[PDB]
Amino acid sequence: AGITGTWYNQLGSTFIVTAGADGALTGTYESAVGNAESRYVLTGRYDSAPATDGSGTALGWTVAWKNNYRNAHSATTWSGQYVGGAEARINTQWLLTSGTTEANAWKSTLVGHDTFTKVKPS
Amino acid sequence: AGITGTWYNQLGSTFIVTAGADGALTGTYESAVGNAESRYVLTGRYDSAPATDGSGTALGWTVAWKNNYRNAHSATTWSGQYVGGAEARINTQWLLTSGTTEANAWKSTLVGHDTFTKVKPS
Amino acid sequence: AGITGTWYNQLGSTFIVTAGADGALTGTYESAVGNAESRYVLTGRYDSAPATDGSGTALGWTVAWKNNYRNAHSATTWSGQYVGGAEARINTQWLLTSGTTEANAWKSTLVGHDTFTKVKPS
Amino acid sequence: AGITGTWYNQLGSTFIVTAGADGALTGTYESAVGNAESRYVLTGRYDSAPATDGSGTALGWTVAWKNNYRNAHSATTWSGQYVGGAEARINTQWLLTSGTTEANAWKSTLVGHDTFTKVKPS
């Protein structure tokens, strides 16, 4: 239940997600903090029966960077865990793969990390 | 879709996926070929209008490792691209995050790569 | 050299490095509290003539986790860039590979990130 | 020592390394099939007392992509393990960080993998 809702990364990106009872993640990712042409479908999965020993809840999701307005020919996956409580966060690593020719495939995939919180960053 | 169908990685895993018209990926991932207790839901996204310059098709998907037989409290995301043709492949990089305590979060995420082909490996 | 000297990550590790004139990094990495038994040799390379247009200085280094007190049969590489100024930092992503059997090689490599600053975290 | 010597990746890059008695890696990396302009210093570390249970030998090294001829303002770290025997290999994953502005730091780091063998590929 703690996953469903709006999350903000450290750079101002926004995503809104619904965590389904059986493990589905569905929602929208906005690469800005207020822009229509910047909204993309996201889908993912999470552990719907996490451990109760204080461990985080494992999850992942994907955004393909095509919407009705733009197509970057690329897709980002986020892999991480949800941690609940007063300082709730989703801590993630991500991979962003661009469609490339075979010659350029070696440089097709960027890697980074995002920390999502329930409140916007300053 | 050249994407819709069954794919095998180089280690004995398989997945079956349907690529929807507007960019959905839906299917099942089987970590051990010939073992239905190792089948898990997969969901993801792909570029439904890739570039016309011979570039690959960017995609990503997630598997949370919970089914009726197992809960590993973990999730893997695969990020990559599909290349069509006689030697069709999905070339990926993946991130496997386990739910952990805060103290153990530094070692929560494994990284690797998978190459999927339409035919089983050796 | 803005790189030469002592750096602290976000979690209580320290390293001291000398940046040589032509691009060598040499020094010691201490994973712990100020625990001498957690000190390890580090070696790496950096760009000794970075672009002077506000770009960071690319660098990388390796620690093999063997010293006189410990052998974890593993090694971490950090890849990142140095950013100078009042809020100087070395922003990195790392890969930690453990020696494994072939059967376990798929889970041999952890991935994460470290931000190093010239002052200790709170 | 089985690490010392010449290794070839899957794409026609070459490196020559000396594994020192107490864990040093020193050598040269050539990204091409031949050419002094494409040769760069490498330095790293390896586990000089690996397990004897059939496990690989953990290692890592860095190449900063500056030599007397070229400067790409970037550096690659390889993290992996050496496996000896009739099919000796060094199995790695790598991170390539480019110096960037702060605005572009999110896309500073590429990730991939290399498999090195003692004999050239195709």
Side-chain angles (χ1 to χ4, degrees), chain A residues 1-86 88-122, chain B residues 1-86 88-122, chain C residues 1-86 88-122, chain D residues 1-86 88-122:
Chain A
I3 289 169
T4 291
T6 305
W7 294 88
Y8 306 95
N9 80 342
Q10 71 278 2
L11 305 174
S13 289
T14 313
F15 81 85
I16 314 177
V17 63
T18 299
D22 286 324
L25 295 180
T26 64
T28 66
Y29 196 95
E30 192 182 53
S31 42
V33 211
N35 182 16
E37 298 63 12
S38 58
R39 304 176 212 132
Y40 300 82
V41 172
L42 73 86
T43 183
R45 303 287 298 165
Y46 75 104
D47 180 6
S48 50
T52 57
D53 63 352
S55 290
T57 298
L59 47 59
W61 69 91
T62 305
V63 169
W65 298 107
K66 175 185 184 296
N67 58 18
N68 294 333
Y69 309 96
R70 320 195 21 188
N71 190 353
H73 303 303
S74 65
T76 297
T77 59
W78 289 259
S79 178
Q81 54 183 323
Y82 161 82
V83 179
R89 61 201 181 270
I90 299 175
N91 297 130
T92 68
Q93 306 279 87
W94 52 257
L95 299 167
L96 159 57
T97 305
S98 294
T100 67
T101 63
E102 295 179 21
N104 293 329
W106 69 273
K107 56 181 179 174
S108 63
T109 304
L110 293 160
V111 61
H113 51 92
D114 269 326
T115 300
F116 293 92
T117 55
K118 295 253 81 194
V119 177
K120 288 183 180 187
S122 43
Chain B
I3 292 174
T4 291
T6 304
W7 295 87
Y8 306 92
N9 80 342
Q10 298 289 42
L11 301 178
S13 292
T14 174
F15 75 86
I16 312 155
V17 65
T18 297
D22 298 324
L25 297 176
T26 60
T28 64
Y29 198 95
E30 191 173 77
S31 43
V33 173
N35 179 5
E37 293 191 16
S38 73
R39 291 198 266 110
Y40 302 81
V41 167
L42 82 75
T43 187
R45 299 290 294 169
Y46 76 103
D47 183 4
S48 52
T52 54
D53 53 11
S55 295
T57 298
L59 48 64
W61 68 91
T62 307
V63 168
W65 297 107
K66 172 182 186 294
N67 65 12
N68 288 337
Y69 309 94
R70 176 112 167 85
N71 191 348
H73 299 311
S74 64
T76 299
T77 61
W78 289 257
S79 179
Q81 51 183 322
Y82 158 81
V83 183
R89 60 194 179 271
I90 301 174
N91 298 312
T92 70
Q93 288 252 283
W94 56 255
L95 295 172
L96 166 51
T97 304
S98 296
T100 72
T101 62
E102 279 197 299
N104 287 335
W106 70 275
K107 52 181 175 183
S108 64
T109 307
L110 291 163
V111 61
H113 49 94
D114 271 325
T115 304
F116 294 90
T117 53
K118 278 261 104 178
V119 171
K120 288 176 183 180
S122 177
Chain C
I3 291 171
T4 293
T6 306
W7 295 87
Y8 310 89
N9 81 344
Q10 69 283 358
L11 302 183
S13 292
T14 320
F15 76 88
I16 314 167
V17 67
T18 295
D22 292 330
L25 297 183
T26 62
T28 68
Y29 196 96
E30 188 176 65
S31 53
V33 295
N35 167 11
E37 292 187 20
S38 72
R39 299 175 45 189
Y40 301 82
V41 168
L42 78 76
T43 185
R45 302 288 297 168
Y46 77 103
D47 176 4
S48 54
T52 55
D53 57 5
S55 295
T57 300
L59 51 59
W61 69 89
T62 308
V63 169
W65 298 109
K66 173 181 182 291
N67 63 13
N68 289 339
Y69 311 92
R70 173 106 171 91
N71 192 351
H73 300 310
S74 60
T76 299
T77 59
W78 290 259
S79 175
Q81 55 183 320
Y82 159 81
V83 183
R89 53 199 191 274
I90 306 179
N91 300 130
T92 70
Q93 305 199 62
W94 52 257
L95 299 173
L96 162 55
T97 303
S98 298
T100 70
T101 60
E102 307 185 2
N104 288 334
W106 69 273
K107 50 175 165 176
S108 63
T109 306
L110 294 160
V111 62
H113 50 93
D114 269 319
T115 302
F116 295 90
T117 47
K118 294 253 71 182
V119 304
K120 291 178 179 183
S122 317
Chain D
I3 290 166
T4 289
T6 306
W7 294 87
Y8 305 92
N9 81 340
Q10 70 282 356
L11 298 186
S13 293
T14 308
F15 78 89
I16 307 178
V17 63
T18 295
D22 284 285
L25 298 181
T26 61
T28 66
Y29 196 97
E30 174 189 278
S31 49
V33 296
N35 168 21
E37 305 181 84
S38 77
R39 303 158 39 227
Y40 302 82
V41 172
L42 80 77
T43 188
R45 304 288 297 166
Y46 77 103
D47 180 5
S48 57
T52 61
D53 54 5
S55 285
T57 297
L59 52 60
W61 68 90
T62 307
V63 171
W65 299 107
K66 179 189 188 298
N67 58 20
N68 286 344
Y69 311 101
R70 297 204 208 105
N71 192 353
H73 300 304
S74 63
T76 299
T77 59
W78 288 260
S79 180
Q81 56 182 319
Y82 158 85
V83 183
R89 50 191 187 276
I90 303 181
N91 294 314
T92 68
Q93 304 197 62
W94 51 258
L95 298 170
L96 162 56
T97 303
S98 298
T100 68
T101 60
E102 297 184 4
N104 290 334
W106 71 272
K107 54 177 178 175
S108 63
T109 308
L110 295 159
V111 56
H113 51 96
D114 269 319
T115 305
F116 295 90
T117 53
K118 292 226 55 95
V119 185
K120 292 178 177 176
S122 174

